[PDB]
Symmetry: D2
Subunit: 122 residues, 4 copies
Amino acid sequence: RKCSLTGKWTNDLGSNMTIGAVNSRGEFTGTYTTAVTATSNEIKESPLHGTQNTINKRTQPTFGFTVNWKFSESTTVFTGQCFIDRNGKEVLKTMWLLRSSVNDIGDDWKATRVGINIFTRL
Amino acid sequence: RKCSLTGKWTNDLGSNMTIGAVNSRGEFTGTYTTAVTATSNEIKESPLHGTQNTINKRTQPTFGFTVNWKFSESTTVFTGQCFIDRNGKEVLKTMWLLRSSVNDIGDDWKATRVGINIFTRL
Amino acid sequence: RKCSLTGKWTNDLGSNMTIGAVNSRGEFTGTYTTAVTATSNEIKESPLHGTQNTINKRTQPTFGFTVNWKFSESTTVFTGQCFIDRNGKEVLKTMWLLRSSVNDIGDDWKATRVGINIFTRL
Amino acid sequence: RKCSLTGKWTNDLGSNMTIGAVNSRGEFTGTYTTAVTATSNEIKESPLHGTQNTINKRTQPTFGFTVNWKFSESTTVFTGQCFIDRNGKEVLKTMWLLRSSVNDIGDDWKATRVGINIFTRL
Ligand SMILES: *[C@@H]1O[C@H](CO)[C@@H](O)[C@H](O)[C@H]1NC(C)=O
Ligand SMILES: *[C@@H]1O[C@H](CO)[C@@H](O)[C@H](O)[C@H]1NC(C)=O
Ligand SMILES: *[C@@H]1O[C@H](CO)[C@@H](O)[C@H](O)[C@H]1NC(C)=O
Ligand SMILES: *[C@@H]1O[C@H](CO)[C@@H](O)[C@H](O)[C@H]1NC(C)=O
């Protein structure tokens, strides 16, 4: 009854991710294949790097990771918690910030989008 | 000129961070010392890990990173862009999500805070 | 058809709200009965006031509203869009910010929570 | 003594707003002139409507309001708190969600931007 991040996951938009073994410092690496984009930039699998919080041997740890898109100048970060829901089943409930690139610091105000994603095992 | 992440930075709240070398894939690690908290827990320097976007090797790249707090069960993620400001200084304009740990999935809705930080070189 | 706000709605958290007539300027009022809290204080039905955007008279307009909670010192704002879903139901897709009250400007950083809600007709 | 929303205000981006008298239910109306946009539609002053919360005589109420843009199909909501600094100068520390109009519910994920604004009296 630990919710583990490692493994293969799919979210509510159709995107898939893989997360490998969580190491000695709570660190993990993975891959991210989004089902949605918004420019003639064609989707490609992109790496992610992140950590899970192991404070107090928490059975439902918090975590975060960054997606380093290999088809966009943008970055997304995701943060959430791994739950064991009503059916003994694992869910990652996350929110994200997607930072776009702007040309001038005066345009910074409009550069950051926000949303949610729920992941379940694939 | 190129706006680099590497080095020592202070933000508008008085927190410090140090980012190391950024490698060929954009990956970096570092340390974070927050000046603010809300726990009875003693603040402790905590590890950070992240990446900067290398698509088109932009002079003012986007990035993100995860701080894996070593005194709280929470996690923060920061996303941003490095700019050269009007005065020639490098500045990181960022936004963050701070994920708290909750016991039940039923409380997930209340678990995520949002805010900004501006970082300047120390 | 046009997706209209007027009427009785429920969200994924079980919360209820009722929106009155929308005037020619897009203004409406309503009431909101949250299913969730984190207070020792009992939930009470609370007023909301908002606007729907009328530019180009879109069939799936954007809108926002503020809920002035009767039993907490907090404020919540919601912004979204009313869509006709794939199955022909009206749905409101929203995000919100929940502003807590802090005693000192020094604690401002931690006072705003963010989340989503999806509303369907009751 | 009690921080008041009524008046003329300007923010960190150079936007101005006006807020009128607050009634006994904490409700107010106003106007908003943004200094920044991102289309060729001329910026036009736009109405706002909001409420402040003063449960149990808060000297620094939380509040929220909605800006009903008259030159965009979008909506912005702002929520924050009215702080009185110790020289008796007021500041509104706010965060906002800006909801863009999208054509298809499948694009809803990318519709909501987030940021901050600090307002002072003008
Ligand atoms: C993720 O995998 C599922 C099932 O294996 C597949 O049908 C779907 O196309 C994938 N989605 C992607 C790559 O976005
Ligand atoms: C950050 O480092 C500087 C020295 O470079 C020090 O004076 C300051 O107190 C440090 N702040 C924190 C919050 O650790
Ligand atoms: C919302 O309304 C329905 C009846 O239409 C009721 O069953 C439910 O208890 C209400 N929920 C709240 C939280 O008021
Ligand atoms: C707001 O007010 C000041 C003083 O009237 C003025 O200088 C500034 O141009 C105004 N900005 C906008 C966006 O209207």
